[PDB]
Amino acid sequence: AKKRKKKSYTTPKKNKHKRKKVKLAVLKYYKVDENGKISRLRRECPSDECGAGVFMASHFDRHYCGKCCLTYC
Amino acid sequence: TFPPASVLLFKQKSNGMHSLIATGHLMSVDPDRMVIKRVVLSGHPFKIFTKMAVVRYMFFNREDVLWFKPVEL
Amino acid sequence: PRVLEVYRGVREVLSKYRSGKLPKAFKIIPALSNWEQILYVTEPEAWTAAAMYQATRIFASNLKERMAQRFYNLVLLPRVRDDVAEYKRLNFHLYMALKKALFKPGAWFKGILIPLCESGTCTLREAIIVGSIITKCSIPVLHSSAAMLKIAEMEYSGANSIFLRLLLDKKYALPYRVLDALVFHFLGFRTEKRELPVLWHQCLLTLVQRYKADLATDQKEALLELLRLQPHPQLSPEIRRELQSAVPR
Amino acid sequence: KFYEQYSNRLQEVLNDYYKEKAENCVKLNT
Amino acid sequence: FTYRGVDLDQLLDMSYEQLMQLYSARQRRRLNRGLRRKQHSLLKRLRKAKKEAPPMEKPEVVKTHLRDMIILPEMVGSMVGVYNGKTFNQVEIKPEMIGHYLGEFSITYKPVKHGRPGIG
RNA sequence: AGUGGAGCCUGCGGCUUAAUUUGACUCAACACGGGAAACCUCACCCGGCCCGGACACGGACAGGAUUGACAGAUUGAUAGC
Ligand SMILES: [Zn+2]
C-alpha cells in the first residue's frame, strides 16, 4: 500500500511543572535534647484513627492534619 | 563544444583522489532546455464525505490555501 | 433526616457530572461508619462515566483494602461489564478508573480480576480490555504471582488464558510453587479431546520463551509430551525449538 | 491471604455544603 | 442623565431588592434567580480594577467571556472586553446601557456584503 | 382544490463568514439524520489547561519514588493537574 511520509515538526514539552523536592523533613518534627529527651515541634492529631504518630501542619494561623482533614484556629 | 563528445564525471574524494561517478556523452547544447524543480506538499484527509473531503497539515495559514487555489490536487 | 436531603442533591449532581470540584460530602464517603447506606442514596447505577472515575479515585486513596475491594465488586466491575456488552468498546473515563483502581493491587485482584474469571461468563473482548491495563501498570511481584496461581488452578475458559499470558509478559522473577501450578495447568489438557484456541498456544509460548531457565528435566519432557498430543502447525515447532535450546538453573 | 479471604465532622461538612450552595447565587451583596 | 426617574447616585446606593422592581422583566427574573458564581467573580474583579486606578485616568480593561452577564449600575464607569467567539471588544460601560446584557455589544457575526453569484 | 402572484416559514442551490457541520441533483434530488439544534444534541469555528503505551539504554528513590489533600491567590473556569 501507498505509504505515508511522516512529517517532522519540533515543539518542546521538555519544560513541565514538577513540585519541589523537600529533602529530609523528619528533623523538623522533633528537637532532640543533649541529654536525650524528645520534644515535638508540631501538634499531634487526636483523630479517630490517625493518632499517636501523625502530625498536623503549621499554617500561618492554624493547624491541619494530612489524613483526616481536621482544621483549627 | 560540438557533439559527439564523450563526457566523464569525477568527484574529489580525499588526499586528492578523483573518483569516477558517472559516464556518458554530450547531448545537444542549448540554454532553452528548461529544467523544472518540483515540490510535492503532503496533506491529510481526516474528514471524508462522498466526493468532498476536509484536508489538513498541507497549509497552516488561511490565505495560504487561497494562494494555491488554482493548483490541482 | 437532613443528611438524606444532602445526598439526594448530590445524586442529581453525579448523574449529570462532567468536570470540576466535587461536593465535599462525596469526598468523605470512606471515612463514614454507615457508608453503604449513603452510597445507595447517591445511586451509583445512574452515575455518569466521568463521575465513576473520580469515585474510584476517592476509594483507592482513603486506605482500607477491604472497603476498597467491596466498592469495585458491587459498583465498578458491573458497570465495566455493562458497557462492553452495550457499546462494544469501553468509555474513556471508565478505562481511566481501572488504571486508578490499581493503586491498591490487593483490592484490585480480589475485586476485579479474580471475580471476573470465576464467573465463567467472561467474554474474550472483556478480557483483552481489562488485560491491557495489567500490561500498562506495573504490579508488585508478590501480588502478581498470587493472582497468577489462582488463574492456573481455575477452570479453563478462552478469556482466562489471556490474563495468564499478560502476567508472564511482565517477565518478573517467579516463586517456584507458582511454576509448579502453571505446569500442572497446561498438562491438564494433555488428555483433552477439545480443540484448543491459538491464545492458549501463545500462553504456552510466552511461558517457555521467558521461563525456560527455571524448568527441570521432569517437567521439561512432560511439556514435549503435551505438544505431541495437542499440536499446532505454526506455534508447536517454536515451543519445541525453545525447549531444545534451554539452559536450566 | 488471597485465597483464604473469601458524628461531629459529618455535620460540619453538611453545613459547608449549604454554605457553598448559597454562594453560587448571591442575590444580595453590594 | 436619569433612569426610570432615578439618578445614578441613588441607583448605586439603592437596595438590591429595589432594583428587582426598577428593571425590565427579564432582568428582574434573573436577579430573583441570583447571580451565578462566575458572574459574582466578574463583578468582584471589576470592583477591584476600578478601585486600583488613578483618579484622572480610565480604569484598566478586564477581559471576559461572559456575554450572559447583565450590566448593573455598579459597572458604570468600567471598561470591559467581551468575547464574540473570536475577538474581544473593549467597551466602556455607559450609564445608558445598564438594562442590557454584555452580549449585545460585541457582535458575534460579520454583516453581509454580497459577492456576485456563480453557477446557480 | 390549488401552487406559481403577496407577506411570512422553511428545504436546496448560490452568497457571505472564523464557522455558517453534513451524503443525495429530472421519480428512488426536493420538512429523508423522528433534524423543532439556546446547553447537550454537534459532526463546525476561536480560544486554554491536561497526558499520550510497551520495550531497550542512560538517570533519580528507603537520607521517601509517587498518590491524595482544608482554606487562600491566580486566568474566560470552587485548576490539590
Ligand atoms: Zn487530613
PDB file of N, CA and C and ligand atoms in Angstrom, chain A residues 64-70, ligand 1:
ATOM      1  N   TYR A  64      -3.361  21.793  60.771  1.00  0.00           N
ATOM      2  CA  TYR A  64      -4.031  20.922  59.796  1.00  0.00           C
ATOM      3  C   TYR A  64      -3.400  19.537  59.625  1.00  0.00           C
ATOM      4  N   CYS A  65      -4.161  18.498  59.966  1.00  0.00           N
ATOM      5  CA  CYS A  65      -3.745  17.109  59.744  1.00  0.00           C
ATOM      6  C   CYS A  65      -3.882  16.707  58.278  1.00  0.00           C
ATOM      7  N   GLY A  66      -2.970  15.845  57.822  1.00  0.00           N
ATOM      8  CA  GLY A  66      -2.916  15.427  56.422  1.00  0.00           C
ATOM      9  C   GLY A  66      -3.404  14.027  56.087  1.00  0.00           C
ATOM     10  N   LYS A  67      -4.433  13.559  56.796  1.00  0.00           N
ATOM     11  CA  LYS A  67      -5.044  12.252  56.515  1.00  0.00           C
ATOM     12  C   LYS A  67      -6.569  12.266  56.669  1.00  0.00           C
ATOM     13  N   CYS A  68      -7.058  13.016  57.656  1.00  0.00           N
ATOM     14  CA  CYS A  68      -8.484  13.045  58.001  1.00  0.00           C
ATOM     15  C   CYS A  68      -9.195  14.372  57.691  1.00  0.00           C
ATOM     16  N   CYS A  69      -8.412  15.402  57.352  1.00  0.00           N
ATOM     17  CA  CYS A  69      -8.894  16.772  57.068  1.00  0.00           C
ATOM     18  C   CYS A  69      -9.508  17.468  58.295  1.00  0.00           C
ATOM     19  N   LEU A  70      -8.682  17.640  59.325  1.00  0.00           N
ATOM     20  CA  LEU A  70      -9.068  18.349  60.542  1.00  0.00           C
ATOM     21  C   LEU A  70      -8.435  19.741  60.559  1.00  0.00           C
TER      22      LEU A  70
HETATM   23 ZN    ZN G   1      -6.140  15.296  56.714  1.00  0.00          ZN
END
